[PDB]
Amino acid sequence: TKTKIMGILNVTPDSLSDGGKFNNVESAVTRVKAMMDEGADIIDVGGVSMITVEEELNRVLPVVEAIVGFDVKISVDTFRSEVAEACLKLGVDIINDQWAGLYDHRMFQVVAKYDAEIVLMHNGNGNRDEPVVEEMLTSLLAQAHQAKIAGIPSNKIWLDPGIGFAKTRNEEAEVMARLDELVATEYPVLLATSRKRFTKKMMGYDTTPVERDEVTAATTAYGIMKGVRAVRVHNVELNAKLAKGIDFLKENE
């Protein structure tokens, strides 16, 4: 099958966001249409990183209602089931839980209640009593089973290694060197390395976030060869074209 291209749609300016016309619904719809033309299969709406549930809904719901009708899957970054359920009622397809359901266990029964997909990202404060790869697998496998208990199929339970979260630069290199072990879980893996600090370490020289798109595409091609089923990137066009060629060559084997 095809490697899914998840485009990043930030409603607020961050350090990896490039050109800034943010928090405009008409501009977001124009950007979503541009991402679809560049080859994006999924639109990932940025979310909270201690506001209330009503405040978090006020952040995402204007953009969600305007883009949910398009021919592209909508993914919302939220880890609280009250926010996810209101988004799922509007027709969003994916809930990107950056806590893998550890913050709100009701997330699993809510996502299954709407026959949707969920992304489980490895996160934490950086502390662990075991090596990072074994601790990441142990955490994600347990949370992936919780969604499985709730009734979500395995092909709809996405696993994100969480590059840039709860890991040192050396620990991220250990995870990126052993992506086959996470793909071996038979859950679809979502690689998220776009313009993060790990891609800056791939450069021998200091760089800006935009200057890291080519090495981000390198992680995409490297990830697809390792068996990942989707990538979360800023540059949709560069990765989608590169993913299309790698998908052709990998299935050719």
Transcribe 33-93 into DSSP letters.
HHHHHHT-SEEEE-------HHHHHHHHHHHHHHHTTSSSEEEEE---HHHHHHHHHHT--
Parallel, antiparallel or unpaired: strands 94-97 and 230-233: unpaired
Q: What is the dihedral of CA 26, 32, 36, 41, to 10 degrees?
A: -150
CA distance 194 to 67: 23
CA distance 167 to 143: 19
Closest CA to 28 of 43, 14, 41: 43
CA distance 94 to 111: 8
* Domains of the chain with CATH codes: 1-253 (3.20.20.20)
Is 145 a known ligand-binding residue?
A: no
Q: Which amino acid, one-letter code, is at 109?
A: Q
Token readout for 155 is: 């092909």
Is 53 a known ligand-binding residue?
A: no
Is 14 a known ligand-binding residue?
A: no
CA distance 119 to 94: 7
Active site residue 196: yes
Structural contact between residues 11 and 23, judged by C-beta atoms closer than 8 angstroms? yes
| Given 80, 178, 195, 196, the catalytic residue | 196
CA distance 109 to 126: 28
Is 10 a known ligand-binding residue?
A: yes
Is 64 a known ligand-binding residue?
A: no
Is 96 a known ligand-binding residue?
A: yes
The approach used to solve this structure was X-ray
CA distance 179 to 188: 12
CA distance 226 to 229: 9
Parallel, antiparallel or unpaired: strands 73-77 and 42-45: parallel
CA distance 225 to 223: 5
Closest CA to 135 of 148, 146, 145, 126: 126
Structural contact between residues 31 and 44, judged by C-beta atoms closer than 8 angstroms? no
Is 60 a known ligand-binding residue?
A: no
CA distance 80 to 84: 6
Is 206 a known ligand-binding residue?
A: no
CA distance 140 to 154: 13
CA distance 101 to 149: 13
Token readout for 123 is: 């996160």
Q: Give me the half-sphere count of Cα atoms (radius 13 Å) on the Cβ side of residue 174.
A: 12
Transcribe the chain into DSSP letters.
-PPEEEEEE-SS--TT--S---S-HHHHHHHHHHHHHHT-SEEEE-------HHHHHHHHHHHHHHHTTSSSEEEEE---HHHHHHHHHHT--EEEETTTTSS-THHHHHHHHTT-EEEEE---SS--SS-HHHHHHHHHHHHHHHHHHHT--GGGEEEE--TTSS--HHHHHHHHHTHHHHHTTSSPBEE--TTSHHHHHHSSS---SGGGHHHHHHHHHHHHHHT--EEEES-HHHHHHHHHHHHHHHHH-
CA distance 128 to 67: 39
Q: Give me the half-sphere count of Cα atoms (radius 13 Å) on the Cβ side of residue 23.
A: 6
Structural contact between residues 10 and 17, judged by C-beta atoms closer than 8 angstroms? yes
Q: Exposure string (b/e) for 161-196, b if CB count within 10 Å is 16 or more?
A: bbbbbbbeeebbbebbebbeebbeeebbbbbbbbbb
| Given 156, 167, 178, 232, the catalytic residue | 232
CA distance 149 to 163: 27
Active site residue 113: no
